[PDB]
């Protein structure tokens, strides 16, 4: 009843309704997916072409933290940019203190603490984005997903946004059919296919596909966009 | 972020501070504790209730040494009492001992605790403490003393008193057995008899806490050499309570 009008107010059943409303805001965004391969991570996202006047290949969504972390999000894009700026500040501080690129689980914990801190007071609003991020460190490849409540987990494959159900089903089938794992390029192709399949829920507007990856044997442990012939091959595979 | 710069305790149209009354209700729902003043000591007593049968009740003590000659007990909310005891010890050290080299008298320390409790009923964005305190002490120039401090910061000196669920019955019993000539042993016996009425479960040394402000204890003073150097406050072990039962 009256327990939904302020943040950080427990309901009689032990719920925070503002965070659930933020999840509702997240559910209205576009579909963002992440796949963990044998030696890296692949991030894919769909961008709606609302008007033909939008300049193609501009308005980049996927963002980079340090030189090895990739981040994508679904929900209110400015909130995602705020979170990415905070993550860049955290990574810079860690690098300055300890002279080593920040490990992915440590970065995930710092982001989670920052998101959680916005559910503790009624003078602030929870973040309305769900974030899929990851990369490569000395321990290997890591993929994480973070929710508006501040809870995060590590995933074999993650999906968020309006077309999350079909994307999750496709990711589960992909994981089941490849127990050994997947290569980076095969992961890029599968991400293209899954984004195209998940777009079939929203056929009212056209979309553009954006793909990035961070792999040890393909990018030497750095985060790089897919723009060349590989992007066209992935698009052709998805449309096939 | 913190915008609670305004008082949460305000006067009702009838002239009553609702939050302090509600804190008093919370105190009145608490377990019984008692204090009795004798000619050569003071006794402070309380019941020890366990949240779980698997909990080691010895790790939780409802009677706390404030100074070597001053101790305290409470009825109400436990964590509030714990924080208040920490603050009281710190104020005793930083307000009196670091200035005069001596521990404060009982009355001044009670006044400091009362100031702390009052500040929680007028400062912004703070809930008043939901405890009532009984403080027993001894000082050179005033003798033995017993005080009661309320959630509003009001404190009163008592020859004997009780707080908690069985407050009225215990107060009547103590009124009927006051003669201005009791000794410490008589006061301990009276306290045990009064507690036996207000305890519904087992009544032994593991469910009662007793403390005394009596005579100096050179055994509880881990050094020798200074003739002027005693910790009057003493907590009775469960074995002694069982023996007295």
């Amino acid at each position: 009843t009256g327990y939904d009008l302020s943040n950080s107010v427990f309901s009689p059943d032990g719920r925070n309704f503002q965070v659930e409303y933020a999840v509702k805001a997240v559910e209205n965004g576009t579909t963002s997916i992440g796949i963990k391969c044998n030696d890296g991570v692949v991030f894919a996202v769909e961008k709606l072409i609302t008007s033909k006047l939008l300049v193609p290949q501009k308005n980049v969504k996927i963002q980079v933290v340090d030189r090895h972390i990739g981040c994508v999000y679904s929900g209110l894009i400015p909130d995602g940019r705020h979170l990415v700026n905070r993550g860049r500040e955290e990574a810079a501080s860690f690098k300055k203190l300890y002279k080593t690129p920040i490990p992915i689980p440590a970065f995930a914990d710092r982001l989670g603490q920052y998101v959680q801190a916005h559910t503790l007071y009624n003078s602030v609003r929870p973040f309305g984005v769900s974030t899929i991020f990851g990369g490569v460190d000395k321990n290997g490849a890591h993929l994480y997903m973070l929710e508006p409540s501040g809870s995060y987990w590590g995933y074999k494959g993650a999906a968020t946004g309006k077309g999350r159900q079909s994307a999750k089903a496709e990711l589960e089938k992909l994981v089941d059919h490849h127990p050994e794992g997947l290569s980076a390029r095969e992961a890029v192709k599968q991400a293209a296919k899954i984004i195209y399949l998940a777009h079939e829920d929203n056929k009212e507007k056209d979309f553009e596909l954006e793909i990035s990856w961070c792999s040890l044997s393909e990018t030497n442990g750095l985060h790089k966009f897919v723009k060349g012939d590989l992007l066209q091959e992935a698009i052709d595979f998805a449309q096939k | 972020t913190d915008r609670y710069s305004f008082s949460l305790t305000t006067f009702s149209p009838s002239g009553k501070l609702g939050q302090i009354d509600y804190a008093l209700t919370a105190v009145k729902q608490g377990v019984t504790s008692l204090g009795i003043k004798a000619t050569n000591g003071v006794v402070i007593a309380t019941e020890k209730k366990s949240s779980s049968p698997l909990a080691m009740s010895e790790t939780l003590s409802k009677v706390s040494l404030l100074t070597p000659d001053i101790g305290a007990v409470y009825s109400g909310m436990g964590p509030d009492y714990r924080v208040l005891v920490d603050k009281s010890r710190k104020v005793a050290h930083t307000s009196y001992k670091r200035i005069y080299g001596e521990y404060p008298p009982t009355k001044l320390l009670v006044s400091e605790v009362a100031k702390i409790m009052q500040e929680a009923t007028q400062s912004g964005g703070v809930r008043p403490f939901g405890v009532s305190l009984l403080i027993a002490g001894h000082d050179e120039f005033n003798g033995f003393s017993l005080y009661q401090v309320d959630p509003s910061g009001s404190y009163f000196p008592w020859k004997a008193t009780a707080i908690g669920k069985g407050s009225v019955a215990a107060k009547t019993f103590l009124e009927k057995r006051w003669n201005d000539e009791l000794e410490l042993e008589d006061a301990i016996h009276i306290a045990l008899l009064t507690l036996k009425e207000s305890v519904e479960g087992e009544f032994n040394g593991d469910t009662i806490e007793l403390a005394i402000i009596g005579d100096e204890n050179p055994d509880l003073l881990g050094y020798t050499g200074i003739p002027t150097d005693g910790p009057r406050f003493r907590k009775l072990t469960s074995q002694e309570i069982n023996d007295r039962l």
Partner: protein
């Protein structure tokens, strides 16, 4: 509606109503059009006046020698954002001897707008902006909304009845895309586009303002007789 009191409250469906009210404030402003080619970028603005004895409200603000914008909505918010953009461009020039990119300025405006929709005690801005510039990557046009969303487009229009101008721009995209080296033709295309949003008024030298930036052209504003040849 109990969820529209402040900017830190979500609705049960996940909507921020103060942001939507600021967008509504934008939708009641005078129409402005932005357009660009591979060599030049142009802004066309229709001014408004209180009455005949009044002057017309300025709608185009210069940010730097290579960058400017036009506003639709609450003018003081446009002044605040324009001052911030001027400071950022000046900082880039002073510290790096570098001309600030248009995309980075859009990012800065997005970040500044986002902070006003998440904390108590502050309202979102009440203006939409069209930003044109020329940098090492060529000509750029951006659209900024007070929700923080910034988009890069070939052309657009904002304000009241801007849909007709937007449809005209969408239809004639391939034409004005290739107007390179002929600034007057691009300006005339923009004027024709903004003519689609007029209902009961005609363009005059008092209510029409134009701005242009380009490869060899610093950001310049034409008003009054300077636009008489474009009517």
């Amino acid at each position: 509606n109990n969820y529209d009191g402040d900017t830190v409250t979500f609705s049960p469906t996940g909507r921020l109503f103060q942001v939507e009210y600021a967008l509504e404030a934008i939708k009641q402003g005078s129409v402005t059009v932005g357009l660009r080619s591979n060599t030049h970028a142009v802004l066309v603005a229709l001014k408004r006046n209180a009455d005949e004895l009044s002057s017309y409200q300025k709608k185009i603000i210069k940010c730097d020698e290579h960058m400017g914008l036009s506003l639709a909505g609450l003018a003081p918010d446009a002044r605040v954002l324009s001052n911030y953009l001027r400071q950022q461009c000046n900082y880039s020039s002073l510290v790096f001897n570098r001309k600030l990119a248009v995309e980075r300025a859009g990012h800065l405006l997005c970040d500044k707008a986002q902070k006003n929709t998440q904390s108590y005690g502050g309202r979102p801005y009440g203006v939409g902006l069209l930003i044109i510039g020329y940098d090492k990557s060529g000509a750029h046009l951006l659209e900024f909304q007070p929700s923080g969303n910034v988009t890069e487009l070939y052309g657009t229009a904002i304000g009241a009845r801007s849909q007709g101008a937007k449809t005209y721009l969408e239809r004639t995209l391939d034409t004005f895309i290739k107007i390179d080296g002929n600034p007057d033709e691009l300006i005339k295309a923009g004027v024709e586009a903004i003519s689609q949003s007029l209902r009961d008024e005609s363009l005059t030298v008092d209510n029409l303002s134009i701005a242009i930036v380009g490869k060899d052209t610093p950001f310049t504003i034409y008003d009054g007789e300077a636009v008489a040849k474009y009517i």
